[PDB]
């Protein structure tokens, strides 16, 4: 179990750690989060009490370094930093725990929710989508645009998701125009899976990461990316059986976790109705269809 120490909490803020969240009052004696499960990526995220605008946060893996949060009064945000002196870090954390100045990552032992949302998400792939090689953790916020959005403006601060575009020469073979547009199996299996992602695990990893950025930061381009990667699978007549079964599980836990009250802005009616009721895979996503119909029948 690892720990992320907070130098202090000088400004009132709602702090998220994965799917959990809690309020910290201005100058409250808060020194961080302990008992963070090893083996998963994690995200620690922030919304200031005085300007709920700009949710922001950090994707990190405690196996890759000792990380802490310190508020920067010049840039006005809580910043993740790496402590390279391991003894200084262990000493600091031990003091914080002994004085019980830390919240405990509150994992119920029956609960696989975080694993199920991050099964295929790997820090190394996050760091290619979010380019800032001098840090081992990755900053994301509500306003960051994607490389595709910038085509349709600062490149250093972009989300470099894999560009998916159904009406593009990449998606459509000359002489198979109708075939490739109505059945996207070529684009999914040869172009994307074999060509770019190399395997379905990496594809699912980017899909899951896009969803989590959409949910935790309200990042619109991430939501677009998540729906495009769903739609590409659902619009393909030939998909490996293990990918369909895994997609159904992935989406089930995403729909389960989504705040009921954000469904109107995080779910695209067209895509979900097409995917569940018109697409080639309309009968292949049994768990997802059942939770969607019982939780968000309005959208359908």
């Amino acid at each position: 179990m690892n720990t992320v120490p907070f130098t202090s909490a000088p400004i009132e803020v709602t702090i998220g750690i994965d799917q959990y969240s809690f309020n910290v009052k201005e100058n409250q004696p808060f020194h961080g989060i302990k008992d963070i499960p090893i083996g998963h990526v994690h995200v620690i995220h922030f919304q200031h009490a005085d300007n709920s605008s700009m949710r922001y946060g950090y994707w990190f893996d405690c196996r890759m370094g000792n990380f802490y949060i310190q508020y920067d009064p010049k840039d006005g945000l809580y910043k993740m930093m790496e402590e390279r002196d391991g003894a200084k870090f262990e000493n600091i954390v031990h003091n914080f725990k002994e004085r019980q100045m830390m919240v405990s990552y509150p994992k119920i032992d029956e609960d696989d929710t975080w694993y199920n949302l991050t099964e295929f998400v790997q820090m190394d792939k996050i760091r290619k989508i979010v380019r800032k090689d001098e840090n081992q953790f990755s900053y994301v916020d509500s306003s960051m645009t994607t490389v595709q959005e910038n085509e349709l403006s600062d490149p250093a601060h972009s989300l470099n998701y894999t560009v998916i575009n159904f009406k593009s020469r990449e998606a459509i073979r000359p002489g198979h125009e109708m075939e490739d547009f109505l059945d996207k199996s070529y684009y999914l299996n040869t172009v994307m899976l074999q060509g770019i992602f190399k395997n379905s695990s990496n594809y699912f990893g980017e899909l899951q990461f896009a969803f989590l950025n959409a949910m935790f930061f309200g990042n619109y381009g991430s939501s677009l990316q998540w729906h495009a990667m769903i739609e590409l699978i659902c619009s393909s007549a030939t998909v490996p059986k293990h990918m369909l079964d895994k997609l159904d599980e992935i989406l089930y836990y995403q729909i389960k976790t989504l705040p009921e009250q954000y469904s109107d802005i995080l779910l695209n009616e067209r895509v979900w109705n097409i995917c569940l009721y018109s697409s080639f895979q309309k009968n292949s996503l049994h768990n997802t269809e059942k939770i969607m119909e019982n939780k968000y029948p309005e959208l359908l």
């Binding site: 009406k167 593009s168 125009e177 109708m178 547009f181």
Partner: protein
């Protein structure tokens, strides 16, 4: 974006554009089988591709063999249309290729956009105009070449005959759409108007009769009357 009454003169500026109408590509007769079921029999069709500024009509004849062994023919027909328009564009010299293609039915937008991905600078647009180009097969010489075709074939026409020697392309397009609207509303009546006077003939190289300017004004009035006539017959007004 879409083409409508506000930007209507755009059709007659000097940027090359084509209308594409697919309403006569997939054509069938519906009949009873010996068992008393219903079946269709395809008949030849055509793509109606028109430059509204010059009158040039690229009539691609769609022979029934192109449907043999194919499923979902109404969907295929839109993609076949897009395939043939793309082939036409690729066959033209660069300086003759259109800058815009206006499809008369919104269902042609994605098929044509996909077939034209190689031409990112050609705009593919819909229109809110209700144009009567489905009535092209009421023009006898067009219907004749389509029905006689035994193989795929492209035939070129000027749908304005020699009108542009005397009138502008705005006026010529207006005459064409009035004639086609009449033929669509009451084909028999419209053809009687056009051909009742045996002294006015159709030149071998033309589609329409050789009316004088004064005769066109009469013909045009007779077509408006017909359209108003049928409107009252239809609605009891």
């Amino acid at each position: 974006g879409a083409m409508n009454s506000s930007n209507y003169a755009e059709l007659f500026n000097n940027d090359i554009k084509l209308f594409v109408d697919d309403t006569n590509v997939y054509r069938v007769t519906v009949h009873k089988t010996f068992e008393g079921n219903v079946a269709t029999k395809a008949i030849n069709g055509c793509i109606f591709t028109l430059n509204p500024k010059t009158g040039h009509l690229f009539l691609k004849i769609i022979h029934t063999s192109v449907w043999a062994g194919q499923k979902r023919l109404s969907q295929l027909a839109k993609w076949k249309t897009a395939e043939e328009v793309s082939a036409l564009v690729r066959s033209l010299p660069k300086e003759e290729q259109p800058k815009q293609i206006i499809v008369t039915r919104k269902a042609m937008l994605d098929p044509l956009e996909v077939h034209m991905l190689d031409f990112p600078n050609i705009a593919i647009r819909p229109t809110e105009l209700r144009l009567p180009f489905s009535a092209a097969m009421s023009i006898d010489k067009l219907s004749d070449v389509v029905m006689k075709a035994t193989e795929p074939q492209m035939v070129l026409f000027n749908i304005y005959d020699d009108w542009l020697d005397r009138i502008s392309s705005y006026t010529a397009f207006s005459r064409l759409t009035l004639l086609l609207r009449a033929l669509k509303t009451n084909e028999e009546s419209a053809k009687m108007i056009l051909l009742s006077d045996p002294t006015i003939t159709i030149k071998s190289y033309h589609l329409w009769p050789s009316f004088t300017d004064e005769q066109w004004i009469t013909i045009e009035s007779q077509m408006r009357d017909l359209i108003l006539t049928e409107y009252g017959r239809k609605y009891n007004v």
